[PDB]
User: Fold this.
Amino acid sequence: MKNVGFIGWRGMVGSVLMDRMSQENDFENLNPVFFTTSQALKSAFDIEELKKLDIIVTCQGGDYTNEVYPKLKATGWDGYWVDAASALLMKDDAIIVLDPVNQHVISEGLKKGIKTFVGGNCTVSLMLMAIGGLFEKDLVEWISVATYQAASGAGAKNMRELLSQMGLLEQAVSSELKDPASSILDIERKVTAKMRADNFPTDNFGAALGGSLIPWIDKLLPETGQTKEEWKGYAETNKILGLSDNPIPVDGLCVRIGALRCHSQAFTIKLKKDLPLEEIEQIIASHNEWVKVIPNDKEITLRELTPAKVTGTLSVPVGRLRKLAMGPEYLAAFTVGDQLLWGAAEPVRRILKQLVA
Assistant:
């Protein structure tokens, strides 16, 4: 059995990985060696120890990877490096994994000698898990996107801040909400006053999220006006699909909303042909076992196409499918996916499974 080292397994993403691996009994197929950065297991910084392993799975973070990866590689170590961090995503030296979508690029990279794999993540992987069928059939000309991203993508303390913000907003009008005859305008004024107060916890986001939204995720990308988050759509999507040399346009606005773990996305997909909606649905549904086409019905949409339904599951529902007023080649679609699973830990768990098989 392969000797696998794990770094950052106590973090949020790492913890989801540990839980998923346990659930699937992945540990009975490999020899796990756990590391730690604490001085209170082996040290995550002991290069000689890391060199003894066949594979290293890390969810520790970019700073960690940029520090040890180079040192480890320098020792001649020829093992595999699986990273949940985005540090090496665009390295010609590594492949972005999301096997249900790009098994072919993965299998080839392996034959070629690629030893570094970075997990497909956030909105890009969730998008591909939802409409990968359209790309696989080469029907996508371009895609305009509008996201509704959860706090987990930012971090554990961000999720906590969101929850605290929601509590404070309600607590500001707790009594008013109790009497069925109170003024809704009085209630709103108080809630709004609270989210604008200096003592309203907004350190993690830099603005209120709770009963609001933030139309900016990462840092500015000067050359295009995009934010890093938005830039990933074009770069990472094509790298995953292996179309970096002849990229497909994927662009839009990424917005942070008051959700915990699920990223949702609204799509305006420009197809290259005019296909019956029924066929498009079949193409979408057939791509993988997790995508789930939701009928464009109200009751079914409310019960199935929401973070409330999707959170904590591997299901990737896609619905609201119909042609747009712009034309028969313009398709509308809305999808919801859990950020911690297909958006983070699952692609890593899957590539590991392959490497130790």
